[PDB]
Each structure stands twice: as C-alpha cells, then as structure tokens.
Amino acid sequence: VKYYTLEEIQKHKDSKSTWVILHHKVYDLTKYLEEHPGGEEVLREQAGGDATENFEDVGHSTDARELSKTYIIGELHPDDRSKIA
Ligand code: HEM
C-alpha cells in the first residue's frame, strides 16, 4: 500500500488534487470530484480533512463501492490519523 502524510491530503484540498481520508484510506476522487451527484463542495469543503463519517453517514451505495475502490491510490499515515483517539 501507499502511505501518504497528512500533509498531502491538506495540500491536496484543491480541485487539482482532491483527496479525502476514508476509513484510513484517502480517496482521490479528483476526476469524480465534479462528477459527484451529491456535491462538489461536500467533498472539497472537507477533502484533505476527514469525510469518513460524512461519507459513511450519507451511506454510499454499492455503486460507490466500485468507484471508491477504483478511485483508490493508498492510505495516509495512520500514525497521525489517530490524533483524536
Ligand atoms: C471515493 C469517492 C466517492 C464516490 C465514488 C462517491 C459516490 C457516491 C454515489 C454513487 C452516490 C450515490 C447515492 C448515495 O450514496 O446516497 C453518492 C452520494 C453521496 N455522497 Fe458520495 N462518493 C464519494 C465521496 C464522497 C465524499 C467525500 C462525501 C463527503 C464529503 C460524499 C457525500 C455524499 C452524499 C452526502 C451523498 C448523497 C447526497 C445526495 O445525493 O444529495 N461522497 N456518493
């Protein structure tokens, strides 16, 4: 797997590179950023951030499962990820 620093998602909080920490796994939905039927902001607004709950809360359908996976590159340092815990 590919472990990215929390610094990434951050700098990657723009359209160019839209990342979102999902279940200890960043989702490069850059291409599917404006394609998102829900909203392009809901993603960006909290892209680099953590939209895990904001992603699971909405309850993504299988259709997403395929995409999400397809739009997977790797996870972010889970060391700084558990900064809350
Ligand atoms: C890997 C990237 C993502 C994919 C492939 C994806 C895919 C989808 C798909 C197919 C829908 C179907 C309907 C549903 O799930 O209820 C959806 C809905 C939704 N997604 Fe995502 N999603 C992604 C990331 C996100 C993120 C990061 C957020 C939040 C920040 C988000 C928020 C939502 C919301 C709120 C809905 C339904 C809202 C509505 O249609 O008004 N999604 N997503």
Instruction: Please report the atom of ligand 1 found closest to the CA of residue 60.
Output: 15
Instruction: Please report the atom of ligand 1 found closest to the CA of residue 45.
Output: 30
Q: Which of 41, 42, 15, 37 is nearest to 28 (CA)?
A: 15
Residue 60 assigned to a binding site: yes
- Mapping DSSP to helix (H, G, I), strand (E, B) and coil, where does residue 75 land? strand
| Vertex 52 angle, CA 19 and 50, to 5° | 55
Q: Is 52 near ligand 1, meaning CB less than 6 Å away? A: no
The method of structure determination was: NMR
Residue 36 assigned to a binding site: yes
Q: Which domains does the chain have, with CATH numbers?
A: 1-85 (3.10.120.10)
Residue 79 tokens, joined:
């060391």
Instruction: Tell the residue nearest (CA) to atom 8 of ligand 1.
Output: 64
- Distance of alpha carbon 71 from alpha carbon 36, whole angstroms: 12
**Can you tell me which residue has the tokens 């558990």?**
82
